[PDB]
């Protein structure tokens, strides 16, 4: 939902107030992806 | 700074290419009551 | 208003008052042709329940702010698809290789290392990617290396 997935493309086109509304989506997507990946890997780390 | 402009029934599109821009001459000028943008911040335009 | 408004009305300018539906973005319609506003079809230049699709501007400087004319521009543009044929006025530096650098090329700001590349670009490419979807090459915009 951010203007772009390259975070340098937020930081090269937007100032702080509106860049926040974009960057916060990128944090949300990525952080969730890591909570997913580490939990999937934990479940595998027991398979091993 | 040209004289004439089109009607909204037949609005003129012109293409800009193979040249260098400057937007400080817009953002520093009270000739315009509005200069309002949706994908970029005005002061970033100079570096974009 | 202090340019374009005419003492009797600057009727030379038109806007569209009717269409079959709404339009797609960036569609310019140059039809004079009469719109049909009842169950009857139309023939000839005009008719009963056939309405002319444009309306003429009556800008007079006696009108209120708002009812007055206001000149408008729509500066539209796109990003990083292609070798950027327009850019804002900022100055270059001399080139540097193989030291950790806060690089920029056409607004691709980042931290990296710049190294002479034996990757076989054809004349057309500006950039290169990889199997991990990472941007790993660029051709300097002043020297085609
Ligand atoms: C002859 C004249 O007044 N030209 C103006 C210039 O002064 C102004 O800086 C510029 C900004 O849009 O617009 C044009």
UniProtKB/Swiss-Prot annotation, chain C:
Disulfide bonds join 42-50. Residues 10-18 are annotated as: Immunodominant HLA epitope recognized by the CD8+. Residues 1-70 are annotated as: Receptor-binding motif. This is Spike protein S1. Changing residue 2 to K: In strain: Omicron/BA.1, Omicron/BA.2, Omicron/BA.2.12.1, Omicron/BA.2.75, Omicron/BA.4, Omicron/BA.5, Omicron/BQ.1.1, Omicron/XBB.1.5, Omicron/EG.5.1. Changing residue 22 to K: In strain: Omicron/BA.2.75, Omicron/BQ.1.1, Omicron/XBB.1.5, Omicron/EG.5.1. It comes from Severe acute respiratory syndrome coronavirus 2. Binds to host ACE2. RBD also interacts with the N-linked glycan on 'Asn-90' of ACE2. Cleavage of S generates a polybasic C-terminal sequence on S1 that binds to host Neuropilin-1 (NRP1) and Neuropilin-2 (NRP2) receptors. Interacts with host integrin alpha-5/beta-1 (ITGA5:ITGB1) and with ACE2 in complex with integrin alpha-5/beta-1 (ITGA5:ITGB1). May interact via cytoplasmic c-terminus with M protein. May interact (via N-terminus) with host bilirubin and biliverdin, thereby preventing antibody binding to the SARS-CoV-2 spike NTD via an allosteric mechanism. Changing residue 18 to L: In strain: Omicron/EG.5.1. Attaches the virion to the cell membrane by interacting with host receptor, initiating the infection. The major receptor is host ACE2. When S2/S2' has been cleaved, binding to the receptor triggers direct fusion at the cell membrane. When S2/S2' has not been cleaved, binding to the receptor results in internalization of the virus by endocytosis using host TFRC and GRM2 and leading to fusion of the virion membrane with the host endosomal membrane. Alternatively, may use NRP1/NRP2 and integrin as entry receptors. The chain holds residues 439 to 583 of 1273 of the full protein. The gene is S.
